[PDB]
Structures are given as C-alpha cells and as structure tokens.
Structure 1
Amino acid sequence: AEAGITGTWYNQLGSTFIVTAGADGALTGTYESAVGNAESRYVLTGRYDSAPASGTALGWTVAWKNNYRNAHSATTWSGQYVGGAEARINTQWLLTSGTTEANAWKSTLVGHDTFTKV
C-alpha cells in the first residue's frame, strides 16, 4: 500500500514523479516535467485514501514556480493507484494559468496521464 505508492514513477511524456505516501494520508515529493515552460524540479503535495477497500483514490498539485522559473500556472492530477506486477497510476489533470478576467474563459487545459512505477 503506502509501500505501493511510495517510489519513482514516469509518465508517457518522459516526466518523473518521486513521492512518499505518509501513514496519515499525506503525499509529498517532487515533479520534473518534460513539457511546458518548466525546468528542474518542483514541489508537489497531495492526499490519498490510507484505508482503501478496487483502486486507491488520490490526487496531487504542482504550482509551476521554483527558484529558476515561474510559469504562473498550476496542475492538479486526480486518479487512482492500481497495484499488481504492472503497477500504475491512471489520472486526469487540469492545468490552470493566471489570466486577466477577459481571458479567463480559456484559462484551463484538461488531459490524462498514465504513470508506470520504476
């Protein structure tokens, strides 16, 4: 479980997610993105169901600001962890950019990522 989630994971774009699942339902770690106006690692934080039944529900957020670059945007991934000998985290994500009120209608992208555990 906790053992299940904690580790290094990669998505289909070549991005890397390193996470630790705490006994209280916390997720903490770092994210390194292959795409966008990003470079180096960014802090992530999230939550997971620490007493799952079925996959395990979880979610996390990254604000794309570090000591090197600021894209003025944040992404949230919502999904579930599924274990076995082909462990995966399947998600859908929302990326919101800070915009003026007149451009807010086009502030949010949606997509999906699948993570494989190393």
Structure 2
Amino acid sequence: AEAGITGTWYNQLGSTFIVTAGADGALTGTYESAVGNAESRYVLTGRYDSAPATDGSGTALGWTVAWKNNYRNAHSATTWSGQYVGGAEARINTQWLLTSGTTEANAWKSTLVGHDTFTKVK
C-alpha cells in the first residue's frame, strides 16, 4: 500500500502510468497509452485500500482514465481494477473495462475487457 504504489509503472503494451498514492486511499497521476486513439497524457484518479491485510495478500486498487485531453477526445473511459503486490518484483495485476460512448443501439458492443500487468521496470 501507500509508499510502494507511488511512482512510474509500465505495462506490457508500453503504456506508462505515474501515480501518487495519498495517505488516505487516493490515487492521482497521469496515463500515457501506447495503443489506441490516445496521444500524450491523460489524467487518472482512483482509490486503493490504505489498510491492507498479516498477511502477505495484495492491496486492492482501481483507477479511471477518460480518453479526452487537449489533443484528442476518444469518447471513452477505462477503469482498471486489480491489486498491488510489493517485493523485489512488485507489480500491479489488473483487469480493465474500456467503455466507448455509443448510441443505444450499439451499446451491446460498447465495452472491451482486457488485463494489464504493470511493473516498475519496463
């Protein structure tokens, strides 16, 4: 939790996420996607369990990114739900949901699901 989450992480797609975990569960930072209709950095906000468990369990967290910045607007948002595992080789394992804004008719195909693993090394 806290101390260990803050920093720069990289996932297998080459995206970068920089976060600051605050004392009381908040997560703030920027995300730069290596793929998709995105350019540069986007703002992210989230929450994490600041009082994780005796035991060697992971810390649960989640964050969101709306794919709109000053360069592009993809009219979509991604939320990543996962857990942080610290240690020699700390990682954040997640599953994500990417929803695009659609018309009611195309709503059945509005969401992509995937998973990303983030490490401190890339």
Give, in angstroms, the shift of residue 24 of structure 1: 1.1
Indicate yes or no: 2:109 matched with 1:106.
Answer: yes
Structure 1 runs (4+) deviating above 2 angstroms are none
Q: Once the two structures are superposed, what CA deviation does each residue of 1:34-75 show, in whole Å capped at 9, x if it has no partner? A: 000000100000000000000000000000000110000000
TM-score by length of 2: 0.95
Measure the CA separation in 2 of the matches of 1:20 and 1:36. 25
**When the two structures are aligned, how many residues end up with a matched partner?**
118
For 1:5-20, what aligned pairs fall within 5 Å after superposition?
A: 5-20=5-20
Measure the CA separation in 2 of the matches of 1:114 and 1:83. 13
Q: Once the two structures are superposed, what CA deviation does each residue of 1:3-23 show, in whole Å capped at 9, x if it has no partner? A: 100010000000000000000
Give, in angstroms, the shift of residue 2 of structure 1: 1.3
Measure the CA separation in 2 of the matches of 1:9 and 1:107. 28
Give, in angstroms, the shift of residue 89 of structure 1: 0.1
Unpaired stretches in structure 1, ≥5 consecutive residues: none
| 3-state secondary structure, aligned to 2:67 | strand
State, as a whole percentage, how many aligned pairs show the same letter.
Answer: 100
Measure the CA separation in 2 of the matches of 1:80 and 1:117. 15
Measure the CA separation in 2 of the matches of 1:113 and 1:39. 19
TM-score by length of 1: 0.98
| 3-state secondary structure, aligned to 1:60 | strand
Measure the CA separation in 1 of the matches of 2:24 and 2:52. 13
Instruction: Provide the aligned C-alpha RMSD in A.
Output: 0.6
